[PDB]
């Protein structure tokens, strides 16, 4: 409603770096807000794509940003009559970024890994890896829970059970308020998908450079399965956290599986022990129900509500014809221990191939009326197809069915404006939460400042 579409702020990165593929707000030890930006195709030292991260200080004029440096060199360790190998070429460093406290977590889901033992090997596969940084202190650490040293022959004998070689850890990421990093790995367990959780503090204290294979005892991974409903489900394509069991001491996980049960798609709510509490099934096959998940209390009852995006949903139209437009689902948490019923509200896109619901960002309370609001992206929507971001306001019964404000892309065609979103943070300290929008196709980030209601 009260976002300013006239005076925007533009940050930019190198051409072709996909600057803006992922973003988040970052507060230093003094509470000063900055913008961490991932650029998963930034060039490295060997003039080859390795990804990169940028930490943008808040300036109303925007501009260029300094780099948050990480080690981009391939590593090799000969230990235990084996040869460990990391490969960072085309690893996509910055395909996901998240900030918690004064720590930044940037992940490379396509970092490859292999283990050589004489003539056998573990196979060169994308286990993924995440890089952790404390910018003020310079501390660095890594976390790659799916690295292993089991040779290829063993997996074949055991029918590829517990095969974490293609995890792509860091594909999606989130951090609980207690400081526990949760990584989505949609390729874990032979593309069933898995989750990897570990406290940030224990990642730093247990990491040493050059080890490549080290134990993080406090970590917790989800479990493999023989149920074909989970096969190729990409469990962990998206991840989020919230309170859904009524116990404020426990933190619940929200996991998206957009190809679950033969591309039906699903979203599951679990406890910290990966025990399933609820499961929301997709409405339409190949709609990618679960592509994006968001958690926020929109109706002001104190109970976190769930939003699920299905960007490829095909709406039924006249003459028995379907139209891909995308759809968002709203699930209001019931009072006390009860199951999440049918959707409370269905928001459906308008522009063909607009992919409404590709990203869903909680905005906090934008208009300061006592109800949290959200922003939904249609990266190829709008009458021109350049992209749109739609603001829906909260209310006592959930969300408004019509948008309060529409943000048209200021970028050219193909910018994927809205592919990444992040809100609920006041960056200029004016008392109103603001919105940052990524457009990796144009290698830029746009900042929308909230202003008093007119």
């Amino acid at each position: 409603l009260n976002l300013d579409p006239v005076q925007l702020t533009f940050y930019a990165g190198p051409n072709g770096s996909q600057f803006g593929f992922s973003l988040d707000f970052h507060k230093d030890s003094h509470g000063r807000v900055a913008i961490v930006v991932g650029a998963p195709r930034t060039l490295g030292p060997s003039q080859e794509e390795t990804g990169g991260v940028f930490l943008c200080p808040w300036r109303a004029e925007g501009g260029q940003c300094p780099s948050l440096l990480f080690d981009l060199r391939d590593e090799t360790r000969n230990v235990g009559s084996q040869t460990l190998q990391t490969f960072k070429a085309r690893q996509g460093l910055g395909a996901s970024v998240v900030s918690w406290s004064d720590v930044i977590v940037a992940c490379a889901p396509w970092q490859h890994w292999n283990v050589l033992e004489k003539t056998e090997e573990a196979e060169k596969t994308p286990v993924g890896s995440c890089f952790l940084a404390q910018p003020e202190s310079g501390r660095r650490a890594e976390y790659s829970p799916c690295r292993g040293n089991t040779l290829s022959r063993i997996y074949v004998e055991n029918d590829f059970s517990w095969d974490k070689r293609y995890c792509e850890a860091g594909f999606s990421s989130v951090v609980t308020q207690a400081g526990e990093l949760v990584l989505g790995a949609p390729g874990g367990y032979y593309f069933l998908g898995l989750l990897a959780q570990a406290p940030v503090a224990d990642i730093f204290s247990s990491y040493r450079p050059g080890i490549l294979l080290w134990h993080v005892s406090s970590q917790s991974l989800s479990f493999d399965s023989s149920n074909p409903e989970y096969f190729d489900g990409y469990w962990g394509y998206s991840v989020a956290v919230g309170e859904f069991d009524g116990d404020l001491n426990t933190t619940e996980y929200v996991v998206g599986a957009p190809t679950w049960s033969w591309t039906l798609g699903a979203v599951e709510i679990l406890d910290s022990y990966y025990q399933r509490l609820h499961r929301l099934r997709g409405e339409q096959m190949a709609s990618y129900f679960g592509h994006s998940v968001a958690v926020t209390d929109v109706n002001g009852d104190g109970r976190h509500d769930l939003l699920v995006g299905a960007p490829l949903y095909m709406e039924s139209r006249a003459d028995r014809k379907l139209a891909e437009v995308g759809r968002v689902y709203l699930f209001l948490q019931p009072r006390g221990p009860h199951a999440l019923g049918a959707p409370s509200l269905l928001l459906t896109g308008t522009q063909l191939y607009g992919r409404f619901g590709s990203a869903i960002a909680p905005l906090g309370d934008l208009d300061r009326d006592g109800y949290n609001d959200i922003a939904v992206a249609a990266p190829y929507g709008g009458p021109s197809g350049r992209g749109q971001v739609l603001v829906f306001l909260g209310q006592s019964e959930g969300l408004r069915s019509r948008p309060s404000q529409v943000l048209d892309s200021p970028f050219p065609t193909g910018s994927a404006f809205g592919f990444s979103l992040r809100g609920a943070v006041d960056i200029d300290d004016n008392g109103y939460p603001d919105l940052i929008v990524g457009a990796y196709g144009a290698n830029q980030v746009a900042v929308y400042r909230a202003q008093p209601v007119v």
Epitope: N78, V79, G80, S81, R208, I211, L213, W214
Partner: antibody, heavy 119, light 108 residues
Framework: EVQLQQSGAELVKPGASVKLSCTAS????????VHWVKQRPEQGLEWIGR????????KYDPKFQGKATITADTSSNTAYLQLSSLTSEDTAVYYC????????????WGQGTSVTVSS | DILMTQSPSSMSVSLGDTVSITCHAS??????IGWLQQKPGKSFMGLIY???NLVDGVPSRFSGSGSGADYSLTISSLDSEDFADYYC?????????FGGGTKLEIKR
């Protein structure tokens, strides 16, 4: 806290067999590798072998191939070391070892089990 | 197998001295070495892993260094508890092999 609690001292005769144990305390035995080390005053320290309790796969120094047999039961959270056809040279102290962080390290040690072979 | 030559076999030193134990390997092991401590009539305690990294709980007066096939364990300002046995161990290749050992004795 990580503690490796081994069995009490054994006193056996030559030709017989003995099975030592290494129970994990404060952690899951399945977490890391579990090694076995032999110590003697003259010969010093010698590496017997290792086991991954998650799957049971083992490695051995070819010197101990035949006598040493390493196993593990995740239920009782314990790893074992069996010694067969015992000899006076098998009289030694036996330690179970696991790493801290590095997968291939030798950081945490049990108190050690004494073995004495004699007629 | 990799032979681990540890020297000296023993040394007579006093409190507060800065001593250095060395360990030579028959071939390069690329810092894949650990250091151990065995107090009199007791079990082992890990000091160093991967050549330089201190085990959690070990005082900072201990320190490891070296590269290739030559490494060193240094103890700055000896404490009354540091008088004990010390061994090096390589894990670059299987089987793991240990050094002969080094005993720190009180000088008088």
């Amino acid at each position: 806290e990580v503690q490796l609690q081994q069995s009490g001292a054994e006193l056996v005769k030559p030709g017989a067999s003995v099975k030592l144990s290494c129970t994990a305390s404060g952690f899951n035995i399945k977490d890391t590798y579990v090694h076995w080390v032999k110590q003697r005053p003259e010969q010093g320290l010698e590496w017997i072998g290792r086991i991954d309790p998650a799957n049971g796969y083992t490695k051995y120094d070819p010197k101990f191939q035949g006598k040493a047999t390493i196993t593990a039961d995740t239920s009782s959270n314990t790893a074992y070391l069996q010694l067969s056809s015992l000899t006076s040279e098998d009289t030694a102290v036996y330690y179970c070892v696991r790493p801290l962080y590095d997968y291939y390290a030798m950081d945490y040690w049990g108190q050690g089990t004494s073995v004495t072979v004699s007629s | 197998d990799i032979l681990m030559t540890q020297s000296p076999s023993s040394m007579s030193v006093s409190l507060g001295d800065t001593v250095s134990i060395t360990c030579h390997a028959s071939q390069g092991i690329s810092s894949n070495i650990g250091w151990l401590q065995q107090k009199p009539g007791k079990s082992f305690m890990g000091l160093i892993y991967y050549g330089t990294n201190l085990v959690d709980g070990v005082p900072s007066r201990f320190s490891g260094s070296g590269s290739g096939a030559d490494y060193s364990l240094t103890i700055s300002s000896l404490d009354s508890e540091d008088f004990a046995d010390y061994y090096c161990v390589q894990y670059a290749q299987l089987p793991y092999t240990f050094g002969g050992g080094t005993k720190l004795e009180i000088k008088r």
